[PDB]
């Protein structure tokens with residue numbers, strides 16, 4: 001909690017979204033894998049609606065590239081002001097914004113609709129209506145008078161819960177808290193680190209709860225979801241770089257029931 | 258009739274050709290806007306991609322005829338030919354290609370075209386890889402004059418005969434008349450092996466275009482004049498499509514009415 005007060009957005013982006021982890025040319029990397037999970041899921045046509053909320057967006061937007069063409073009202077969120085600012089810089093095309101164009105290009109490539117990456121970014125920027133503070137530790141993560149339409153038709157969340165929870169039970173409650181934001185019958189797309197215990201963001205050294213695939217599945221069931229899909233990416237040696245001790249990445253497609 | 262005079266005018270006029278103006282006029286927006294699928298850029302790239310996707314156009318060696326300062330016309334080709342020769346009449350164009358080959362920052366930026374080719378080829382290739390492969394496969398950049406019976410000269414470096422030819426907006430842009438156009442086509446055809454393929458892209462019913470201070474004269478040709486010249490030169494026409502230039506893409510840089518793409522196979 002106080003650890004996140006030293007969290008440096010630029011250090012985080014450099015660590016996870018610039019080469020090598022940010023090289024998208026090799027389809028066997030973690031970046032293409034993530035984008036693929038997202039794209040394939042939305043391509044089913046079963047994840048749809050009017051409103052969507054991204055939970056713990058941090059300073060990144062890649063997690064919404066495939067989502068944005070299925071949801072007209074999108075809400076992005078984060079605990080930290082500095083992350084919300086970094087997002088605003090990209091949404092408003094302000095100076096020094098992070099360059100997400102390689103990810104936008106690869107989403108267009110993967111989706112296979114012949115869309116140009118500029119149109120994709122345009123649609124995302126237009127459909128993200130707001131960027132709000134959030135704390136998944138709170139029973140009402142967004143607060144009381146939320147400007148965000150509730151409940152949402154769908155949730156997305158990448159690398160938040162395990163990264164803000166000291167242990168399983170805390171992870172489980174955090175999942176409980178965000179689930180209240182989701183309409184019954186709605187969809188949650190959850191991405192996260194597997195068996196990770198720490199990662200770095202500049203001066204910040206963050207603690208993570210190491211979770212397994214089966215622990216993720218069980219937590220989803222406990223929270224009232226049917227697990228439609230749960231896949232694992234094993235982190236290859238050359239992508240183990242000293243910025244963390246992640247062993248793999250999970251993708252879960254869950255439906256509130 | 259005597260050919261020298263018309264050829265002399267053409268060579269003279271091209272001494273004023275400005276590569277950067279030409280690039281801005283034709284390969285930056287609006288004509289360089291690749292987001293609109295109905296634009297001329299995506300159409301050209303589509304013709305090339307679909308043709309190479311048939312698998313029917315392959316071999317070891319390819320020659321691009323009148324490359325000028327552009328490389329888009331080879332984006333889909335480069336995965337099918339180990340050895341690629343680029344060519345142009347003007348040293349200033351060859352220099353511009355030199356800059357791109359060295360990946361210099363001052364070079365024209367073709368990355369939107371590279372990305373779009375990757376997008377429509379549908380193999381999930383990243384654009385950095387496409388560009389790296391093109392740079393690796395261009396083995397030489399050579400002077401050329403299509404009005405000469407041997408356009409590359411005698412004892413040229415180029416592997417002859419080639420398995421395939423590509424040529425975009427060259428023949429009609431350097432030929433004073435239809436007879437000249439036909440002869441130019443005859444000349445480049447000597448470079449292609451029997452059974453080899455020619456991919457020809459060009460302007461329809463155009464009489465002029467701008468390249469900075471240079472305002473050049475073009476022989477206006479129709480689709481049926483293009484088909485006949487190809488037949489006359491000893492080709493079977495496999496494909497010949499027409500793009501009609503939208504009014505919003507008529508920017509005053511030329512009086513082009515449309516664009517043709519011909520896929521032709523040399524009889525042999």
Ligand SMILES: Nc1ncnc2c1ncn2[C@@H]1O[C@H](CSCC[C@H](N)C(=O)O)[C@@H](O)[C@H]1O
Pocket residue numbers: 004007055056057058059060063078079080083134135136137157158159160163164
């Ligand atoms: N108590 C809390 N409630 C909700 N989000 C929190 C939180 N404490 C930290 N966060 C945010 O959780 C994020 C983890 S980083 C994940 C970044 C992005 N979602 C991605 O896909 O790369 C950080 O941005 C951090 O600021």
Ligand SMILES: Nc1ncnc2c1ncn2[C@@H]1O[C@H](CSCC[C@H](N)C(=O)O)[C@@H](O)[C@H]1O
Pocket residue numbers: 267268271274283322323324325326327330345346347350401402403404424425426427430431
């Ligand atoms: N006598 C000649 N023989 C072969 N090419 C010539 C020529 N005279 C001029 N050219 C070249 O013909 C080109 C026409 S511009 C077209 C350039 C490029 N292939 C494209 O696709 O946009 C110019 O580069 C010009 O220098």
Ligand SMILES: O=CNc1ccccc1
Pocket residue numbers: 016030159163193196199244246249
């Ligand atoms: O630790 C969390 N961030 C992370 C982001 C992308 C890939 C692997 C880890």
Ligand SMILES: O=CNc1ccccc1
Pocket residue numbers: 283297426430460463466511513516
């Ligand atoms: O050369 C004149 N017209 C032209 C039109 C589109 C692309 C290249 C050239």
